[PDB]
Amino acid sequence: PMSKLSDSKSVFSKLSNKQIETIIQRYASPCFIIDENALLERARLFQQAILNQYQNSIAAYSVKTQSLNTIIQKFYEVGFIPEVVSSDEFEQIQKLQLCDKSIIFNGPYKNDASLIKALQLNAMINCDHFDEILRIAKIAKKLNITAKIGLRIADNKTPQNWSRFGFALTFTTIDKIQQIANIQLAGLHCHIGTNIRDISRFTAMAKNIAELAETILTKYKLTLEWIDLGGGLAGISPTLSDKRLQPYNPFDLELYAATIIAPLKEYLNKTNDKTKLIFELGRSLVDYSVALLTTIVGTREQNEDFQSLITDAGIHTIPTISTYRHPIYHLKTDSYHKKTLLLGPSCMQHDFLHDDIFLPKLEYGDKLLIDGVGAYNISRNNEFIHLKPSVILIDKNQQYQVLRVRQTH
Amino acid sequence: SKLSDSKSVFSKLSNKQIETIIQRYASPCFIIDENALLERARLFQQAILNQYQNSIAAYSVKTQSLNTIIQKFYEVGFIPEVVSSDEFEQIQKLQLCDKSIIFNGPYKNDASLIKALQLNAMINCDHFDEILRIAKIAKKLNITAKIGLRIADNKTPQNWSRFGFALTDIFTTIDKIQQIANIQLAGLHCHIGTNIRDISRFTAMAKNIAELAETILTKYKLTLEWIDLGGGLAGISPTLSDKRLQPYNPFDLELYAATIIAPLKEYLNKTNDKTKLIFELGRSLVDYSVALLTTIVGTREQNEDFQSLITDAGIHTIPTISTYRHPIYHLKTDSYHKKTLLLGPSCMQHDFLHDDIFLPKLEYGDKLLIDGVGAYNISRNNEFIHLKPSVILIDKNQQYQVLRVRQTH
Numbered sequence: 174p175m176s177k178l179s180d181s182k183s184v185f186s187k188l189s190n191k192q193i194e195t196i197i198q199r200y201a202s203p204c205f206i207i208d209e210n211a212l213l214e215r216a217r218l219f220q221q222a223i224l225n226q227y228q229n230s231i232a233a234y235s236v237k238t239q240s241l242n243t244i245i246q247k248f249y250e251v252g253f254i255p256e257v258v259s260s261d262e263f264e265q266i267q268k269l270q271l272c273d274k275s276i277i278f279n280g281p282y283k284n285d286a287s288l289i290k291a292l293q294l295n296a297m298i299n300c301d302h303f304d305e306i307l308r309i310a311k312i313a314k315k316l317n318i319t320a321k322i323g324l325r326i327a328d329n330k331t332p333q334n335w336s337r338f339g340f341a342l343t344f345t346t347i348d349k350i351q352q353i354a355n356i357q358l359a360g361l362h363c364h365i366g367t368n369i370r371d372i373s374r375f376t377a378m379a380k381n382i383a384e385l386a387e388t389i390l391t392k393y394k395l396t397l398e399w400i401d402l403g404g405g406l407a408g409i410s411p412t413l414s415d416k417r418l419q420p421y422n423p424f425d426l427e428l429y430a431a432t433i434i435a436p437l438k439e440y441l442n443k444t445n446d447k448t449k450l451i452f453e454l455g456r457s458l459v460d461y462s463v464a465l466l467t468t469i470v471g472t473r474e475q476n477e478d479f480q481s482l483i484t485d486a487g488i489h490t491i492p493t494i495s496t497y498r499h500p501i502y503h504l505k506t507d508s509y510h511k512k513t514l515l516l517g518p519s520c521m522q523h524d525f526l527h528d529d530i531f532l533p534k535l536e537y538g539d540k541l542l543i544d545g546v547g548a549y550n551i552s553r554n555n556e557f558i559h560l561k562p563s564v565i566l567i568d569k570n571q572q573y574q575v576l577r578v579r580q581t582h
Numbered sequence: 583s584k585l586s587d588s589k590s591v592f593s594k595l596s597n598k599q600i601e602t603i604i605q606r607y608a609s610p611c612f613i614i615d616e617n618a619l620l621e622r623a624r625l626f627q628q629a630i631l632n633q634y635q636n637s638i639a640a641y642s643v644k645t646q647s648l649n650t651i652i653q654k655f656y657e658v659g660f661i662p663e664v665v666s667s668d669e670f671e672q673i674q675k676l677q678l679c680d681k682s683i684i685f686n687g688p689y690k691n692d693a694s695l696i697k698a699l700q701l702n703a704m705i706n707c708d709h710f711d712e713i714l715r716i717a718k719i720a721k722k723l724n725i726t727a728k729i730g731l732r733i734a735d736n737k738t739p740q741n742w743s744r745f746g747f748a749l750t751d752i753f754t755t756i757d758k759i760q761q762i763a764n765i766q767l768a769g770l771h772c773h774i775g776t777n778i779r780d781i782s783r784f785t786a787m788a789k790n791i792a793e794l795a796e797t798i799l800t801k802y803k804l805t806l807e808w809i810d811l812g813g814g815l816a817g818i819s820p821t822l823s824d825k826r827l828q829p830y831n832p833f834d835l836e837l838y839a840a841t842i843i844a845p846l847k848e849y850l851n852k853t854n855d856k857t858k859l860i861f862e863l864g865r866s867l868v869d870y871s872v873a874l875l876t877t878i879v880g881t882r883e884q885n886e887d888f889q890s891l892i893t894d895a896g897i898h899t900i901p902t903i904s905t906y907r908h909p910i911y912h913l914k915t916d917s918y919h920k921k922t923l924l925l926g927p928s929c930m931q932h933d934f935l936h937d938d939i940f941l942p943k944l945e946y947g948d949k950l951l952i953d954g955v956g957a958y959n960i961s962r963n964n965e966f967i968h969l970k971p972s973v974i975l976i977d978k979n980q981q982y983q984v985l986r987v988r989q990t991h
């Protein structure tokens with residue numbers, strides 16, 4: 174019964190048919206829309222959650238999840254430190270000419286130029302393979318300075334967190350590091366997956382990371398400068414295999430912060446709260462503040478009990494629709510719903526938004542709102558068949574601000 | 583295994599040439615061999631023309647949408663074939679002397695239709711309500727629109743499809759079209775799938791289309807103006823579900839042409855060869871003339887029975903790698919191979935170029951060439967994590983031409 178946008182729990186339930194028509198008139202269909210108020214409320218509440226649990230906590234902005242410059246700026250304005258996983262992302266942040274050049278540099282591939290600038294700005298660099306530690310050392314001699322680094326750890330003692338990415342925690346690697354000159358171990362990094370709703374996995378990882386920081390404490394007389402627990406917390410959209418049809422409530426960030434931090438408080442207290450605790454939540458912060466407006470542009474079948482419709486948005490506009498049941502809302506005053514097949518604007522057999530959803534009868538020109546698409550869609554748009562659609566911010570004054578102009582030939 | 587001993591059109595490519603390409607345009611880097619590409623194009627036109635004089639090769643824009651490549655095929659005699667309003671507009675911006683164009687696809691917006699109806703384009707509709715939108719536009723212009731009907735060859739088991747009018751009461755659809763003012767049936771369009779290696783599916787479709795064209799001629803005394811047989815012929819790369827690991831030879835176009843045309847010559851001669859016969863092959867024409875140069879940038883494991891390496895290109899640079907076993911060649915000199923895992927420059931579980939290929943031991947700075955990437959990769963590049971790489975044309979003269987500049991922030 175919450176099929177209708179105005180009757181939903183969506184951030185965008187406030188949007189009338191008239192407002193949607195105006196957005197599309199100005200910026201064309203399909204159109205991404207981002208609500209600034211909801212987005213920055215979530216950002217600030219996350220900072221409160223972690224700081225209430227540990228006062229030397231730092232929220233880092235996961236650029237890859239939502240890489241629009243304007244959004245990065247706004248999270249930076251409330252105290253987030255940019256976190257990048259590539260040299261391009263690293264240089265994106267530099268071009269923003271931010272006053273505070275603090276930055277977290279992750280990723281399996283950091284080119285030489287990126288690592289030079291990073292060292293000059295004393296970024297926090299977390300390495301996940303050995304050859305990179307060596308390349309940083311040679312740079313750390315040419316550049317007459319010692320380089321602090323962190324090590325990405327794989328929580329391979331936890332079955333659900335096992336990963337080939339990072340040094341496995343199942344030590345020989347740290348013995349080598351300290352005989353290495355110009356390199357000084359300064360932190361740990363661990364990122365165990367994505368869309369994690371079983372926060373037992375965060376407890377497990379935090380316990381093993383704490384045991385590691387304790388063993389590093391004794392076998393090496395070293396207190397870590399930072400512990401980065403990555404991201405991975407679940408968003409609001411159920412997976413397609415999930416039996417739940419309705420979206421989840423945005424995950425309780427106080428529950429997340431208390432669960433993951435609890436196994437680490439013992440170590441952090443010995444360090445007199447000088448070890449920084451870093452969090453890199455992306456999806457769970459940004460997903461539900463972004464929706465896609467799409468228009469029905471054709472009909473293949475239309476009978477009492479079934480309709481097959483063509484939309485102007487498909488899997489090349491929101492690729493994560495192939496993995497998640499993103500909520501789909503309509504604008505009709507109509508009680509009778511029928512099985513509905515929503516096809517994208519491609520005659521490719523995998524380009525559909527949903528094959529088993531119940532919606533009222535729709536026709537050419539009707540609009541749908543696809544909610545919870547704020548993570549890992551916009552920046553994956555491409556120029557295949559259809560050019561990239563507009564991205565609009567509903568700013569904190571309820572005024573539209575274009576963040577990406579619709580592409581044209 | 584090694585590039586020099588390969589059957590690849592880049593077999594001829596030197597380490598110094600490759601290192602020059604990368605030094606000049608960075609890694610990863612797409613390369614397109616002009617000679618191989620246009621030779622394939624001419625052979626296809628020659629194949630279909632020797633079977634039927636009024637055969638027209640159409641260029642599948644979506645398969646390889648770089649403007650320069652489009653212009654080349656246009657100069658060889660190909661007519662542009664588009665499947666979206668954006669592609670349509672891309673072609674008009676080329677300002678070709680001959681405005682002939684094929685307009686396919688499930689979504690054609692009003693602006694493109696108004697333009698296409700007044701440029702004598704062959705417009706193939708796949709759902710009825712598009713027909714009615716054309717009819718109403720045509721009435722505003724006081725013209726009668728000639729349209730083609732996309733047909734689903736649902737009598738052939740492998741060709742069953744939702745896209746197009748079902749050929750299995752199809753005549754109930756053309757009966758309705760006969761009554762609609764400002765519309766006249768003029769052509770048929772059939773596109774039965776992709777990466778089709780069983781040409782029995784083409785011969786079956788051509789026979790069914792021939793029968794439909796005969797019935798139309800007898801029921802409505804109507805001789806069709808064109809028959810569009812679509813594309814879909816297979817490329818050189820096996821699927822990952824394929825048991826075979828080595829690339830196939832480029833499919834025999836003479837065989838394809840002779841077999842798909844033969845069921846239609848009774849009709850086409852009955853028409854004194856005035857029906858135009860259009861072909862829209864893409865993958866099979868362009869895939870093997872394009873390769874991706876990638877560089878090893880790190881190591882995770884290195885035994886003599888197994889190695890796990892990090893490349894600077896992944897599924898976001900060549901997304902068809904998740905579906906196809908694209909040939910991967912090295913430039914070294916060594917007999918000894920080992921199970922090799924090639925990890926993309928992302929720490930996502932699914933970002934790997936190949937997880938059980940045997941390759942010589944490779945190290946940081948070593949280079950690989952992934953062949954057969956010319957279909958459905960370049961235009962799907964995006965700005966997620968890594969910006970888009972350069973695309974380089976290897977001229978007729980073996981000189982380098984920049985078709986897409988490396989992207990930077």
Ligand SMILES: *Cc1c(COP(=O)(O)O)cnc(C)c1O
Nearest residue numbers: 235367404405406453454455456
């Ligand atoms: C993906 C990722 C994140 C964010 O992950 P989410 O699921 O969106 O929360 C943070 N840090 C790193 C290193 C990552 O790879």
Ligand SMILES: *Cc1c(COP(=O)(O)O)cnc(C)c1O
Nearest residue numbers: 642776813814815862863864865
């Ligand atoms: C995809 C497509 C083509 C090209 O298909 P290929 O497999 O690359 O040969 C031609 N015409 C239409 C309508 C298409 O959708």
